Each structure stands twice: as C-alpha cells, then as structure tokens.
Design a protein around this ligand. Structure first.
Ligand SMILES: [Cl-]
Ligand SMILES: [Cl-]
Ligand SMILES: [Cl-]
Ligand SMILES: [Cl-]
Ligand SMILES: [Rb+]
Ligand SMILES: [Rb+]
Ligand SMILES: [Rb+]
Ligand SMILES: [Rb+]
Ligand SMILES: [Rb+]
Length: 164
C-alpha cells in the first residue's frame, strides 16, 4: 500500500466525465474538473487538462497522468503551506498519506482549516485527533472514506485499506 493505491481505492477510476459525491464534474481517479453545473464548462476544462479535444472521454493512461500530477501537486502544495508543512514533516510516511488524501479530496485550504485536529496530530495525540477529525462535514458526508483516513492517522498502519 502507498498513496497511489490508497487514493485509487477511495476515488475509483472512470474514463468518462461523471459527478463526484458532491455533484461536481470529475474524471479519472478523482480529478475534479469544475464546480460549474455546466457540462460544457467541464468538457472545456478536460480538453485543456489533457491537451486534446476530448468531448468527455479519456484513456486509462491519461487518467493516470492526471492522477500523478494531482498527487505530486498535493504533496508540493502541502510543503508550501505554512499550516500543513510542519504537520506533514512531523508525521511518519504512512500518516503523511492520510494527510495527502485529505488534501486531494477537500483542497489545501479546507484541510488547513482543521486547526485543532492538526495540532493534535502534531502532538501525536492520535486517539484525540481521530475523535476530533470525525466532527466535520467531511466525515458526515463521506463517513466510510473518512473512517479509513482517520484509522490511518490513528494507527499509522494500512489496516483500513488492506484488502480493498
Ligand atoms: Cl489539471
Ligand atoms: Cl491520544
Ligand atoms: Cl474533539
Ligand atoms: Cl464514504
Ligand atoms: Rb470519486
Ligand atoms: Rb448539469
Ligand atoms: Rb516525516
Ligand atoms: Rb482531487
Ligand atoms: Rb481554523
């Protein structure tokens, strides 16, 4: 297990534009295209992302290319974010994956807003952090995925992903 396998479990793989769990047009492995309700807007974003006129459909290789970009950019962005960088650097490599997963799903600003949970994580108060993380719109709207991520933070193991 690694961050790519983890996010592939949590996000799936779809080669045609679809709506994510917030109703937003997405493709590939959790690649958000736009929050606009316009499918045409989403299609334009897609073509720009891939560099060819797609009308909504990509290949697996293209999906993986966007996914690698998105993971790389999530890590890079964490390391440029004054709230998230110290927490990331304080965490072991398994727990870092949980933080990357959250940023992938909700964006850096969103994660950086979890001030109390971030503190508990940097203090290595794992059970306290896990309790606090669940008191969130995040957890309520995607509870099973949040449970997996939270277990990863609580334990520093892949137990919530091993056989998925
Ligand atoms: Cl992009
Ligand atoms: Cl604790
Ligand atoms: Cl709490
Ligand atoms: Cl879920
Ligand atoms: Rb998804
Ligand atoms: Rb629509
Ligand atoms: Rb580290
Ligand atoms: Rb994403
Ligand atoms: Rb905050």
């Amino acid at each position: 297990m690694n961050i790519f396998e983890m996010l592939r479990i949590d996000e799936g793989l779809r080669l045609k534009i679809y709506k994510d769990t917030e109703g937003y047009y997405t493709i590939g492995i959790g690649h958000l295209l736009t929050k606009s309700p316009s499918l045409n807007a989403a299609k334009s974003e897609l073509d720009k992302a891939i560099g060819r006129n797609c009308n909504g459909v990509i290949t697996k290789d293209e999906a993986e290319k966007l996914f690698n970009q998105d993971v790389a950019a999530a890590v890079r962005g964490i390391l440029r974010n004054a709230k998230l960088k110290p927490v990331y650097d304080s965490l072991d490599a398994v727990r870092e994956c949980a933080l990357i997963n959250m940023v992938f799903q909700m964006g850096e600003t969103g994660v950086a807003g979890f001030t109390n949970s971030l503190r508990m994580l940097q203090q290595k108060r794992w059970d306290e952090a896990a309790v606090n993380l669940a008191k969130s719109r995040w957890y309520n709207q995607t509870p099973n995925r949040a449970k997996r991520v939270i277990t990863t933070f609580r334990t520093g193991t892949w137990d919530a992903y091993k056989n998925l």
